Amino acid sequence: ATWWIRQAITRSIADQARTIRIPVHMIETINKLNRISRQMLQEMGREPTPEELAERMLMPE
Amino acid sequence: YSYTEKKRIRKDFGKRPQVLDVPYLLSIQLDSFQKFIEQDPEGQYGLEAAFRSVFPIQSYSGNSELQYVSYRLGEPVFDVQECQIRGVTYSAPLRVKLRLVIYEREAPEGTVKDIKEQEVYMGEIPLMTDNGTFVINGTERVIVSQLHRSPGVFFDSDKGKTHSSGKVLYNARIIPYRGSWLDFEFDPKDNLFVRIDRRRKLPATIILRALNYTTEQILDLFFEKVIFEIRDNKLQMELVPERLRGETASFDIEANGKVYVEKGRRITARHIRQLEKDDVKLIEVPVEYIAGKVVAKDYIDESTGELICAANMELSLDLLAKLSQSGHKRIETLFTNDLDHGPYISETLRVDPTNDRLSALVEIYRMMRPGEPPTREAAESLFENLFFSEDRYDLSAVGRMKFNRSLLREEIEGSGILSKDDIIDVMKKLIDIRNGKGEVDDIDHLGNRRIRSVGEMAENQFRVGLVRVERAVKERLSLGDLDTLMPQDMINAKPISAAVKEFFGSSQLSQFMDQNNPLSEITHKRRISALGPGGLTRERAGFEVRDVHPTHYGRVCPIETPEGPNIGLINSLSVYAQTNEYGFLETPYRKVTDGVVTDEIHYLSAIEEGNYVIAQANSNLDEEGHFVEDLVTCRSKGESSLFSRDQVDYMDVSTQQVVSVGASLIPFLEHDDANRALMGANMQRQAVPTLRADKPLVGTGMERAVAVDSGVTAVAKRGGVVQYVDASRIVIKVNEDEMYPGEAGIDIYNLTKYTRSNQNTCINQMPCVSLGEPVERGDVLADGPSTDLGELALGQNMRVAFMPWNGYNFEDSILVSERVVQEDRFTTIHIQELACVSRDTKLGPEEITADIPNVGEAALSKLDESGIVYIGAEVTGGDILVGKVTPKGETQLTPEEKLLRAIFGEKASDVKDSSLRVPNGVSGTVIDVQVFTRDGVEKDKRALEIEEMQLKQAKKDLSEELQILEAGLFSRIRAVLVAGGVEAEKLDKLPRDRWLELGLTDEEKQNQLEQLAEQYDELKHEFEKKLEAKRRKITQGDDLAPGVLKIVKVYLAVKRRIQPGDKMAGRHGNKGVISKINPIEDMPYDENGTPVDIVLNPLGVPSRMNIGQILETHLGMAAKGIGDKINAMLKQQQEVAKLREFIQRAYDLGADVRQKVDLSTFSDEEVMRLAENLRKGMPIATPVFDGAKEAEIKELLKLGDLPTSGQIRLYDGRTGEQFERPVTVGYMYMLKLNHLVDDKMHARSTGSYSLVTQQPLGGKAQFGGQRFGEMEVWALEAYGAAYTLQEMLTVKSDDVNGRTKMYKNIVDGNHQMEPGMPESFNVLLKEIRSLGINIELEDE
Q: Which of B319, B336, B355 is nearest to B215 (CA)?
A: B355
Strands (E), B700-790: 714-715, 720-725, 730-734, 746-749, 755-756, 762-763, 766-767, 774-775, 780-783, 787-788
**Among the partner residues A45, A46, A49, nearest to B935 by beta-carbon distance:** A49
Task: Give the Cα separation of B488 and B443 in Å (integer).
Answer: 47
Please give the span between the terminal C-alpha atoms of chain A, in angstroms, as a whole number: 39
Question: Which 3 state secondary structure label does DSSP give B898?
Answer: helix
Distance of CA B378 to the CA centre of its chain: 44
Output the 3-class SS for B662-698. CCCCCCCCCCECHHHHHHHHHHCCCCCCCCCCCCCCE
Q: Which of B210, B214, B362, B228 is nearest to B290 (CA)?
A: B228
What's the angle, vertex CA B1026, arms to CA B1023 and CA B1032, rounded to 5?
A: 130
Task: Give the Cα separation of B966 and B971 in Å (integer).
Answer: 8
Task: Give the Cα separation of B439 and B436 in Å (integer).
Answer: 7
Beta-carbon contacts below 8 Å between A and B: 21
Q: Could you tell me whether strands B911-913 and B884-887 are parallel, antiparallel, or unpaired per DSSP bridges?
A: antiparallel
Q: Is the CB of B492 less than 8 angstroms away from the CB of A38? A: yes
Q: Which residues is B1226 bridged to in the sheet?
A: B800
Q: Minimal Cα–Cα distance from B888 to chain A, Å?
A: 25
**In chain A, what is the greatest distance between 2 CA atoms, to the nearest angstrom?**
41
- What CATH number should be reported for the domain holding residue B849? 2.40.50.150
Using CA atoms, how far residue B1078 sits from B124, B1037, B1090, in Å, is 58, 55, 15
Residue of chain A nearest B488, judged by CA positions: A42
Judged by a CB distance cut-off of 8 A, whether residue B494 touches chain A is yes
Q: Which of residues 119-138 of B touch A (CB under 8 A)?
A: 120-121
CB B1175 within 8 A of CB B1126: yes
Q: Is the CB of A42 less than 8 angstroms away from the CB of B935? A: no
Task: Give the Cα separation of B294 and B327 in Å (integer).
Answer: 19
Using CA atoms, how far residue B506 sits from B136, B493, B498, B510, B511, in Å, is 10, 19, 11, 7, 8
Contacts with B162 (C-beta within 8 Å, 6 or more apart), sequence order: B169, B188
Q: How many helices (H) and strands (E) does chain B have?
A: 34, 62
**Among the partner residues A42, A46, A49, nearest to B120 by beta-carbon distance:** A42
Task: Give the Cα separation of B1294 and B1313 in Å (integer).
Answer: 13
Residue of chain B nearest A35, judged by CA positions: B492
Task: Give the Cα separation of B13 and B349 in Å (integer).
Answer: 71
Which class for B703: exposed (0-12), middle (13-18), buried (19 or more C-beta within 10 A)? buried
Judged by a CB distance cut-off of 8 A, whether residue B75 touches chain A is no
Q: Which of B180, B181, B182, B201 is nearest to B192 (CA)?
A: B201
Question: Which 3 state secondary structure label does DSSP give B729?
Answer: coil
Task: Give the Cα separation of B311 and B300 in Å (integer).
Answer: 10
Q: Which of B561, B562, B564 is nearest to B552 (CA)?
A: B561
What phi-psi label fits residue B339: left (phi over 0), alpha (psi between -120 and 50 degrees) or beta? alpha
Judged by a CB distance cut-off of 8 A, whether residue B935 touches chain A is yes
Contacts with B444 (C-beta within 8 Å, 6 or more apart), sequence order: B544, B545, B547, B549
Q: Is the peptide bond before B1179 cis (omega within 30 degrees of 0)?
A: no
8-state DSSP, B1161: G
Q: Is the CB of B494 less than 8 angstroms away from the CB of A38? A: yes
Q: Kindly state the helix (H) or strand (E) to which residue A35 belongs, with its residue range.
A: helix A24-44
CB B700 within 8 A of CB B672: no
Task: Give the Cα separation of B746 and B968 in Å (integer).
Answer: 7
Tally Cβ neighbours within 10 Å of residue B392.
14
Instruction: Tell me which chain B residues have a C-beta less than 8 angstroms from the C-beta of A45.
Output: 74, 93, 95, 121
Instruction: Tell me which chain B residues have a C-beta less than 8 angstroms from the C-beta of A51.
Output: 935-936
**In chain B, what is the greatest distance between 2 CA atoms, to the nearest angstrom?**
138
Give the range of the structural domain holding residue B922, as residue numbers without chain letter.
828-944+1050-1056
Please give the span between the terminal C-alpha atoms of chain B, in angstroms, as a whole number: 94
Reported resolution, Å = 2.7
Which class for B434: exposed (0-12), middle (13-18), buried (19 or more C-beta within 10 A)? buried
Q: Minimal Cα–Cα distance from B911 to chain A, Å?
A: 28
What amino acid is encoded at B746 in this protein?
A: I
Q: Minimal Cα–Cα distance from B993 to chain A, Å?
A: 41
Residue of chain A nearest B1037, judged by CA positions: A49
Instruction: Tell me which chain B residues have a C-beta less than 8 angstroms from the C-beta of A41.
Output: 121, 493
Which residues of A lie inside 8 Å of B (Cβ-Cβ)? 38, 41-43, 45-46, 49, 51, 61
Which class for B898: exposed (0-12), middle (13-18), buried (19 or more C-beta within 10 A)? exposed
Judged by a CB distance cut-off of 8 A, whether residue B72 touches chain A is no
Q: Minimal Cα–Cα distance from A40 to chain B, Å?
A: 11
Residue of chain B nearest A39, judged by CA positions: B489
Contacts with B380 (C-beta within 8 Å, 6 or more apart), sequence order: B361
What amino acid is encoded at B215 in this protein?
A: T
Using CA atoms, how far residue B583 sits from B145, B149, B153, B402, in Å, is 10, 11, 17, 12
Task: Give the Cα separation of B506 and B89 in Å (integer).
Answer: 13
